[PDB]
Amino acid sequence: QTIANAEEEKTNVAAAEAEKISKEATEALAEALPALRSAEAAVDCLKKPHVTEMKNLGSPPAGVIVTARVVLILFNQGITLNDPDEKVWKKAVTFMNNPQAFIDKVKSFDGENIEPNIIEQSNKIIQDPSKKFNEKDMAGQSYAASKLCAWAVNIVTFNKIFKQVKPLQDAQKQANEILEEKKKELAIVKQRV
Numbered sequence: 001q002t003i004a005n006a007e008e009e010k011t012n013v014a015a016a017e018a019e020k021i022s023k024e025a026t027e028a029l030a031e032a033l034p035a036l037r038s039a040e041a042a043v044d045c046l047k048k049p050h051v052t053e054m055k056n057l058g059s060p061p062a063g064v065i066v067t068a069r070v071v072l073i074l075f076n077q078g079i080t081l082n083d084p085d086e087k088v089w090k091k092a093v094t095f096m097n098n099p100q101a102f103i104d105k106v107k108s109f110d111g112e113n114i115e116p117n118i119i120e121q122s123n124k125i126i127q128d129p130s131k132k133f134n135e136k137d138m139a140g141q142s143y144a145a146s147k148l149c150a151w152a153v154n155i156v157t158f159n160k161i162f163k164q165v166k167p168l169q170d171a172q173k174q175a176n177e178i179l180e181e182k183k184k185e186l187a188i189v190k191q192r193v
Helices: 002-041 049-057 062-075 099-109 118-127 144-192
Strands: none
Touching: 002 144, 049 062, 049 099, 049 144, 062 099, 062 118, 062 144, 118 144
């Protein structure tokens, strides 16, 4: 009885520690949802107007044919950043040729992480100090653009966060499951004692 009592105490302490780790992980999880939600709220920035410009723009400003890269990139339409501008722009029109079509895609196309090759190429540009693309520095260029990129930036930050939350949720769920199992065991041995 005294051995089983000592065993029951050790399992009760281990369960209490697991429950504290579980609480810290749920707090980290609760920071990592505002994470997603913040970005998700900042994902509808792009609208049915701003695209129908880009279609009709026909001619090009310089910085808008950087927005037109990330765009193709994320949608995984190939060609990367090696091909010239002018031929990149004839690839960022064909999409928009139906505005309602496009906005349709953007809401759906979300997926979760989409593709881990792409996000490098898109991260490259954003992580380049040169060629602007902050989203303000865009505006000045061809306004619309400012919206398109703002989203495109807000998507990247999402992906980056949606790689933080996945691990954090996984670590949370494991810690929760162990804490519950340890508590049930602790309850049973306490009853036996």
